[PDB]
């Protein structure tokens, strides 16, 4: 006969969730809690409202300077973040250099919008040749062409008279301005193109004090050309003026850029293209939509994101150990 009885016990169920512990692996428990998000959508999205700027086969240098093949980007909307491929094809079509280029890219990461403006009219070049400045390295569609936002001045009749030109930033916002110099192959090329054999380019700001000189040298052919173009850039402060003077080898500007909205942004390296979707979190490998505190997709993320960790697994134990 059983006299009255009472027992104490604990919960169990059908759960095969396994956690780990410092001393024991794959411990099966009643309840678990995963805290790591591992799946994304392989696509580049809008970020809340805004569609990212995706340069396709373009580089940042190629966009701003105005590569013929980059015309798709002549007047971009305000963006949420820029996307650039790892080694874009359309960079500096005419071979040379973009000075302090990495730093310039740096600014872009805090800029959401430009507004292209003309600051020296191409038509204003009355005593020089705006329209001979054209190269085979710089092809529109078989038509050999040039960058669009600058202008390659050339001697008219036989001579190249001294340029003195200026623009005063009367806007309330800052002005990104670009220009450049052309380095010929020998004395002969120099004198054919600009007549004057000894030349210079002076550029002044409230802070700029630059005087450039062409640098004649015998060089390798790049894209069939031996000469070089070297481009330079500055920020022109509100209510400050910029002044050019030259004498040859001048790559003059026509258009400038007003920094018109600043904010969070990144230059995001990614091969991807536009995914026609939308998130609150974007990764160069795909967007994440998750409540988790942690993800393991890619450490360079933008937007309202979980914190990157390198784990394959992050799972917490909440319930108790389940029966053998």
């Amino acid at each position: 006969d059983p006299g009255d009885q009472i027992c104490i016990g604990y919960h169990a169920n059908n759960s095969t969730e396994q956690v780990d512990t410092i001393m024991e692996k794959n411990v099966t428990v009643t309840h678990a809690q995963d805290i790591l998000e591992k799946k994304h959508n392989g696509k580049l999205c809008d970020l809340d409202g805004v569609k990212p700027l995706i340069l396709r086969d373009c580089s940042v240098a190629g966009w701003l300077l105005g590569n013929p093949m980059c015309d798709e980007f002549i007047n971009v909307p305000e963006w949420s973040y820029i996307v650039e491929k790892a080694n874009p094809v359309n960079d500096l079509c005419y071979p040379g250099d973009f000075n302090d280029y990495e730093e310039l890219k740096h600014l872009l990461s805090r800029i959401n919008h430009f507004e292209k403006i003309q600051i020296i009219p191409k038509s204003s070049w009355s005593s020089h040749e705006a329209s001979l400045g054209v190269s085979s390295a710089c092809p529109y569609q078989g038509k050999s062409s040039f960058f669009r936002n600058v202008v390659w001045l050339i001697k008219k009749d036989s001579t190249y008279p001294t340029i003195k030109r200026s623009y005063n930033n009367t806007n309330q916002e800052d002005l990104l301005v670009l220009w450049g110099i052309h380095h010929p192959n020998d004395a002969a090329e120099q004198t054919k193109l600009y007549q004057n054999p000894t030349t210079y380019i002076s550029v002044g700001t409230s802070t700029l004090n630059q005087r450039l000189v062409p640098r004649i040298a015998t060089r390798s052919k790049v894209k069939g050309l031996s000469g070089r173009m070297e481009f330079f850039w500055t920020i022109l402060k509100p209510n400050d003026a910029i002044n050019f003077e030259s004498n040859g080898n001048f790559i003059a500007p026509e258009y400038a850029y007003k920094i018109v909205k600043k904010g969070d942004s990144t230059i995001m390296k990614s091969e991807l293209e536009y995914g026609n979707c939308n998130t609150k979190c974007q990764t160069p490998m795909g967007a994440i939509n998750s409540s988790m505190p942690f993800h393991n997709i890619h450490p360079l993320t933008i937007g309202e994101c979980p914190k990157y960790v390198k784990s394959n697994r992050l799972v917490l134990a909440t319930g108790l150990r389940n029966s053998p």
Partner: protein, 177 residues
Amino acid sequence: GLFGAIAGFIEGGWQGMVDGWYGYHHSNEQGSGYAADKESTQKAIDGVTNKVNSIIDKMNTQFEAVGREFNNLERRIENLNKKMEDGFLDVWTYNAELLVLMENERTLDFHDSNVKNLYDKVRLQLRDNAKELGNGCFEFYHKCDNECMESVRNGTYDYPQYSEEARLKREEISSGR
């Protein structure tokens, strides 16, 4: 476990206790059934919810990698930059995995220590009015109906009230009839 209760002296957990983490299974004259302990199940939910939020919240601010790009003659600081963001990513990976690992063990001994502590809640209430079997069960020396089983659950169990009937049935079993 550290306290010897879960997967210990109580071998096996009850598939049938579906409304709490810890509880009781009585068996008297009227029959039997399951009833879960009211405070310790709640004592554990609070302890687990506070810990889960404490871990998530501690890691709320943590290193965030930023893109920086350097040219052909910035090879050094290019490399300096890389090892730095990598370094930090590794520290936080380690800080994270190791926190879970550690608080998982401690999560289990909270559950274990709670079971063993509830068994001793009953053991020091009944004392010698019932026999400790060693399998985690008590067998009474007196008669206990359903409002009496309830008094053990909520802590109301009255010792002087039953100590007379129990000490007389202890006398019956001492003689051996």
